[PDB]
Design a protein around this nucleic acid. Structure first.
Length: 90
RNA sequence: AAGCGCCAGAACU
RNA sequence: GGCACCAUUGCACUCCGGUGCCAGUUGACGAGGUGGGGUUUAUCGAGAUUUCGGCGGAUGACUCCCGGUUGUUCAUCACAACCGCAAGCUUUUACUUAAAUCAUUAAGGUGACUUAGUGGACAAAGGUGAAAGUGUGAUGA
């Protein structure tokens, strides 16, 4: 079920790679320490974000609080990642 | 310090 | 890389849909070279995705004019080939810091790439001395 990494979608696709990465670190920093925020603007990966929390409890409070939150005019949709990311698994 | 200057076709970002 | 649009609500850990508009980046590595006017596709090699393509410059070549050398003095007009602070032709003889590519590893940038250092090697043309040979007449001191 719950995972170290959280999946964020329904984000504004117009916003560039580096800005959004720094902008999402502005909010998810309070819940706990972040290891790496993966951002891609490709066809299958745009308007999406993977945030790696070192604590699982950090990822849970993040989903509970930032769900539905309006970020760049768009309300956020957050779920747990299907599998563990490559920095925590290995 | 004159195989040197420039950039807009092309290519890459 | 950026802005608009069409399209995408999509679960990944070296990049990763299209069109148009805009911006950025690449875009010659050294040697050598200027009496003047015209003309023109301006010399030499090194390298090897573009050193391609475009445009500008240019000391080249050619030609004529101009001023000169050499043809054993030296004045003058031809004739012959040259030179534009150098200068007949051939056979030889040094000198003339090649740089980039390559490998490498530091700085800067979102990136394409950029700036600099280090390591080692390789030229061609030309010109600059030297050595032996071979090149005019006509008229006058």
């Amino acid at each position: 079920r719950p995972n170290h990494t959280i999946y964020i979608n329904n984000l504004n696709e117009k916003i560039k790679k580096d800005e959004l990465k720094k902008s999402l670190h502005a909010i998810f920093s309070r819940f706990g320490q972040i290891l790496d925020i993966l951002v891609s603007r490709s066809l299958k990966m745009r308007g999406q974000a993977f945030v790696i929390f070192k604590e699982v409890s950090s990822a849970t409070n993040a989903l509970r609080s930032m769900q539905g939150f309006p970020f760049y005019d768009k309300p956020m949709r957050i779920q747990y990642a299907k599998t563990d990311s490559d920095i925590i698994a290995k």
